[PDB]
Design a protein around this nucleic acid. Structure first.
Length: 686
RNA sequence: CGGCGCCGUUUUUUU
């Protein structure tokens, strides 16, 4: 296919005789079948056409051409020889396609690909990987590459993470010696013989969990049983943490201080010791676990007929993921091969799990439709996620987070359980329930948004959460830029929004303030994850006291409010840390993958800077005007609509400077560049 | 409304 590179001595001889030319090759970023090099003497560049006549040279390499020319030798390879792209199947190879079309397509051997990739390849259809080119044979149109696992260098990533953690007050040290003495000290733990009498034994039922692929601990489980008259019996089963954490111990004090678990991209800073978090409390499959359950009989539409709260002993059958449950929903009348599913206990079959998934999905769909008919608000934006290596636990790939039917299925029943427990504990203890609320947005900014939308010709209503949801729903269909424009408008509409708060009901004396604005419900609380939240442990204690298992808590409403305030602060800090870790690893990706060119839509304009939204990578970056080669810049607010005009510094002294006006919803082109020595990156408007 | 004329502000589920 390609021509063999020439000998160095003949290249030197040809340079001496003068019939060969040197230069730097540049490839057209739009028509990839042509490239050129600057002329040594003439004004017109030397042209090389096609990819064969380019002869495996990449963009930026210093080459020798022979005369209409052709590359015959490369002196110094200046290109990084690293690319970012997507994997797919075509056997021993997988295909890797880069985002830059000046780089060829690369074979990656299957043993380098992720473990789950061969069985469920469609899970990795939009996951972004780095591949380094190690060869390019003469007889192949495809380079041979190596997939780059373990994004970054641990020598430099860890100090950055430590600084991020330290600037927010996250305690990440080891648990004390007195904390570990409050744990059970025995041999591999077994349930005491005196618990089987006071609990409900559900070890014979079919119960399972659905959680992310990178799940660390498991907090909740589901079961569904079809009844004889067309109804269903559905149960939600929560790990029993308050049994292992006695009130007033060093373990209790440390968990109260940390108040939440922090989930970094590469590790976790937990709230409880890894003996509990990983072995005794986590609902691992095929082990007798103590849980606390809520059980309903539901009509096929989702109506509650009777309700039961209790303590149970369960034994999970399988561990599903959000991509495993989705394959069940989308195949209602066909067998899923076991090779595409996780292991299951011999006591239960795969069909008894598939039928339960479908029967839960139908009810969840009905509940979701009715909830959005009753006037609920959903205000979600884009987010970014990373995959991990099974052998070591280091990130290697990066994709855009997707919300699907499995997520909605789990969310509906978690919401229903949370509302049920909220009502139960609020009836039981009016002055000590730990609830969660959300106030209505700010009036101030609303006028500015409605005026701006009227001027831009976007009819948006803000009288109610349901009207606002409908207004955001109807945004010029689902064209290429319709989704981006919806993203920008959602980002603008989420600015007047306020923040949700934990609180103790014994201090708010107005029933109208208990409401949750975005969900449009009179009462709410958090109940379904006590391992990674301490408010959940508190409500578990409260409900156990409500059912008569223990005595009423001695803790006061003032102490409950103080702990709620602490939980609010730590949840805020955890959110910021979890965002900054994703920013850090995307900076690592940019640094190792070179500068990335893309298209962006302006989300905001400031006096000397403007935010953009990188459409290809789903990230938001701010561009500063002082960092560009501009003759000048000016800012003008015409009514309520802002505008920024830029006058480029001309490259030469005969033509007039170019003026470019940028306004919101406009389209620009940007380049992402890695900083010299740091894990940061910048956006350049050129 | 705040912070220093210039900047800051979100809901839900799982981990």
């Amino acid at each position: 296919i390609f021509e063999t590179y020439m000998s160095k001595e003949d290249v030197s001889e040809g340079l001496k005789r003068g019939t060969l030319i040197q230069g730097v090759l540049r490839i057209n970023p739009k028509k990839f079948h042509e490239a050129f090099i600057p002329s040594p003497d003439g004004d017109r560049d030397i042209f090389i056409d096609g990819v064969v006549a380019r002869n495996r040279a990449l963009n930026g390499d210093l080459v020798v051409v022979k005369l209409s020319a052709k590359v015959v030798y490369i002196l110094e390879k200046k290109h990084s020889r690293a690319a970012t792209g997507f994997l797919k199947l075509l056997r021993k190879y997988a295909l890797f396609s880069p985002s830059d079309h000046r780089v060829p397509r690369i074979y990656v051997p299957l043993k380098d690909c992720p473990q789950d990739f061969v069985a469920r390849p469609k899970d990795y259809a939009n996951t972004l990987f780095i591949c380094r080119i190690v060869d390019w044979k003469e007889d192949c149109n495809f380079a041979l590459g190596q997939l780059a696992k373990s994004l970054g260098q641990a020598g430099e990533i860890e100090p950055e993470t430590e600084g991020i953690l330290t600037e927010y007050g996250v305690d990440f040290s080891d648990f004390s010696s007195e904390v570990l003495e409050c744990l059970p000290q025995g041999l591999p733990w077994t349930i005491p013989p005196e618990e089987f009498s006071k609990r409900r034994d559900l070890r014979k039922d079919c119960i399972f969990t659905i959680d992310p692929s990178t799940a660390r601990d498991l907090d909740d489980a589901l079961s569904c049983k079809p009844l004889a008259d067309g109804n269903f019996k559905v149960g939600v089963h929560i790990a029993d943490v308050s049994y292992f954490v006695p009130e007033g111990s060093d373990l209790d004090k440390v968990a109260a201080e940390r108040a939440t678990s922090v989930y970094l991209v590469q590790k976790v800073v937990p709230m409880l010791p890894r003996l509990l978090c990983e072995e005794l409390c986590s609902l691992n499959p095929m082990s007798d676990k103590l849980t606390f359950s809520v059980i309903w009989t539901l009509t096929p539409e989702g109506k509650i007929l009777d309700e039961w709260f209790g303590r149970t002993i369960i034994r999970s059958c399988t561990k599903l993921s959000y991509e495993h449950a989705q394959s069940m929903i989308e195949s209602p009348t066909e067998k899923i091969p076991a090779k595409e599913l996780p292991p299951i206990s011999p006591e239960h079959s795969s069909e008894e799990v598939h039928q339960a998934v479908l029967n839960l999905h139908g009810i969840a769909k009905q509940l979701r439709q009715q909830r959005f008919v009753d006037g609920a608000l959903r205000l979600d934006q884009l987010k970014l996620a990373f995959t991990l290596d099974h052998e070591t636990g280091l990130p290697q790939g990066c994709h855009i987070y997707e919300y699907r039917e499995s997520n909605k299925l789990v969310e509906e029943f978690m919401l229903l359980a949370n509302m049920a427990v909220a009502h139960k504990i609020h009836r039981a203890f009016p002055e000590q329930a730990l609830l969660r609320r959300h106030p209505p947005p700010q009036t101030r900014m609303l006028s500015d948004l409605v005026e701006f939308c009227d001027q831009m010709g976007l009819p948006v209503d803000f009288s109610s959460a349901g009207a606002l949801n409908k207004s955001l729903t109807q945004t010029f269909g689902d064209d290429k830029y319709s989704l981006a424009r919806k993203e920008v408008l959602t980002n603008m509409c989420s600015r007047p929004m306020q923040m949700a708060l934990y609180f103790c009901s014994g201090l708010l004396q107005d029933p109208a303030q208990f409401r949750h604005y975005a969900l449009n419900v009179p009462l709410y609380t958090h109940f379904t994850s006590p391992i990674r939240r301490f408010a959940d442990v508190l409500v578990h204690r409260l409900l156990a006291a409500a059912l008569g298992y223990r005595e009423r808590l001695d803790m006061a409403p003032d102490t409950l409010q103080k702990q709620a305030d602490h939980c609010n602060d730590r949840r805020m800090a955890s959110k910021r840390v979890q965002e900054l870790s994703t920013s850090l690893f995307f900076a690592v990706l940019v640094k190792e993958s070179g500068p990335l060119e893309s298209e962006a839509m302006v989300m905001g304009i400031l006096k000397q800077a403007f935010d953009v939204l990188v459409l290809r990578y789903g990230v938001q970056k701010r561009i500063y005007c002082n960092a560009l080669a501009l003759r000048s810049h000016h800012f003008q607010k015409v009514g309520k609509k802002p505008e920024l005009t830029l006058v480029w510094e001309p490259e030469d002294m005969e033509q007039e400077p170019a003026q470019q006006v940028i306004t919101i919803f406009s389209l620009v082109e940007v380049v992402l560049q890695a900083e010299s020595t740091a894990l940061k990156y910048s956006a350049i408007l050129k």
